[PDB]
Amino acid sequence: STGSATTTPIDSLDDAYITPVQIGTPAQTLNLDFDTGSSDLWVFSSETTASEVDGQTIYTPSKSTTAKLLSGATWSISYGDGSSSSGDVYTDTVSVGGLTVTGQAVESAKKVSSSFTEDSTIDGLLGLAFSTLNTVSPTQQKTFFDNAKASLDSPVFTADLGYHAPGTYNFGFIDTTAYTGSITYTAVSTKQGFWEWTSTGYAVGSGTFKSTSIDGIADTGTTLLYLPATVVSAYWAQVSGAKSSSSVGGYVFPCSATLPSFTFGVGSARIVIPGDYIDFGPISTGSSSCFGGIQSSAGIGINIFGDVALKAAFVVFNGATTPTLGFASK
Numbered sequence: 001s002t003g004s005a006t007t008t009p010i011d012s013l014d015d016a017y018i019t020p021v022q023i024g025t026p027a028q029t030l031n032l033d034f035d036t037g038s039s040d041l042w043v044f045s046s047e048t049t050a051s052e053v054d055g056q057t058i059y060t061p062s063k064s065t066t067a068k069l070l071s072g073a074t075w076s077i078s079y080g081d082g083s084s085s086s087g088d089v090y091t092d093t094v095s096v097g098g099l100t101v102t103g104q105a106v107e108s109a110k111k112v113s114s115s116f117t118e119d120s121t122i123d124g125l126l127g128l129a130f131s132t133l134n135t136v137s138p139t140q141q142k143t144f145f146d147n148a149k150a151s152l153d154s155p156v157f158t159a160d161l162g163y164h165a166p167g168t169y170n171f172g173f174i175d176t177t178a179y180t181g182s183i184t185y186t187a188v189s190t191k192q193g194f195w196e197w198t199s200t201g202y203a204v205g206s207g208t209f210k211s212t213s214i215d216g217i218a219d220t221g222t223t224l225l226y227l228p229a230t231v232v233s234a235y236w237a238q239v240s241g242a243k244s245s246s247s248v249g250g251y252v253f254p255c256s257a258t259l260p261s262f263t264f265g266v267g268s269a270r271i272v273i274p275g276d277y278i279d280f281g282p283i284s285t286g287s288s289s290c291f292g293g294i295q296s297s298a299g300i301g302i303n304i305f306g307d308v309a310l311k312a313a314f315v316v317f318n319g320a321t322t323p324t325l326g327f328a329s330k
């Protein structure tokens with residue numbers, strides 16, 4: 001079996017991507033944020049505090065004939081950006097791009113952080129990391145991908161994020177049409193439960209490629225590119241006027257500046273992020289200061305290859321026994 005769902009940016013900045021997902025019977029369509037950095041599939045529901053819902057589409061378990069309460073089951077999650085959500089758990093039928101999975105754990109939000117209520121375009125999340133991260137207790141649950149794995153033609157899903165445009169999430173197959181050249185596969189470490197890999201180095205603009213091992217995670221749920229201080233400083237050093245602002249909390253540059261591209265290594269291959277992708281617009285409406293798409297990871301504890309880097313390549317998440325990450329130019 002296979003599945004193909006179109007993923008759409010929530011705004012002109014590509015801050016995040018939402019993908020339509022069918023939940024329940026009859027189907028209740030919710031726009032979820034596919035997150036390979038988390039392993040929980042939670043959604044705004046009829047249970048969420050009415051005060052914390054602002055325009056989001058809610059999942060109403062009582063309206064689904066295939067929905068059953070997972071007695072005693074609870075969930076609580078907190079993301080890097082500080083966001084938070086919690087509540088009870090239901091099991092229902094979930095379909096993505098035609099690919100159906102029965103008995104999927106659907107975590108209905110009872111409490112959501114302000115950041116979420118603020119986001120009207122995102123109805124919930126679909127974690128695509130490794131199931132070891134699931135927050136459901138006392139019985140941990142499996143992710144949607146883990147539940148589909150067996151039924152998939154190939155235990156894989158690909159990420160084809162668009163720049164200022166829609167992209168595609170495919171399950172069970174590799175569209176050899178969506179990329180150029182060859183796919184370079186690289187080893188993945190599951191130890192932390194992330195799609196953790198090791199980049200082989202980087203280059204700023206047309207500069208010399210620096211061979212250096214960069215351990216990071218493929219995170220579709222993260223907007224920007226978080227790299228080590230040294231790497232980030234070398235990039236922004238090539239942008240006249242760019243600087244690290246304590247007030248804004250990151251590297252900003254003159255909106256009139258031309259951003260050099262960023263090259264990251266995967267094996268012997270090279271993925272180039274056009275400079276246009278690194279521009280995240282005015283820090284504030286009307287401001288002439290722009291937010292950089294490449295920030296330091298010094299405070300996270302881990303480097304994150306977020307949307308900024310991922311959307312520059314066709315990404316294959318091989319959920320095989322020996323998971324691997326595939327990167328191809330597109």
Ligand SMILES: CSC[C@H](NC(=O)[C@H](Cc1ccccc1)OC(=O)N1CCC(N)CC1)C(=O)N[C@@H](CC1CCCCC1)[C@@H](O)Cn1ccccc1=O
Pocket residue numbers: 015016033035036037038078079080081082083119125219220221222223224226280291300304
């Ligand atoms: C340093 S992880 C900060 C990161 N959240 C972001 O990247 C958000 C995402 C976003 C953007 C726009 C609207 C709504 C949400 O967007 C920004 O933070 N920004 C920075 C400010 C803006 N200038 C650009 C946009 C993050 O927690 N991701 C997690 C996924 C979800 C997606 C939905 C919103 C909450 C976070 C996740 O995979 C990260 N994870 C990875 C490993 C371990 C724990 C962990 O938790």
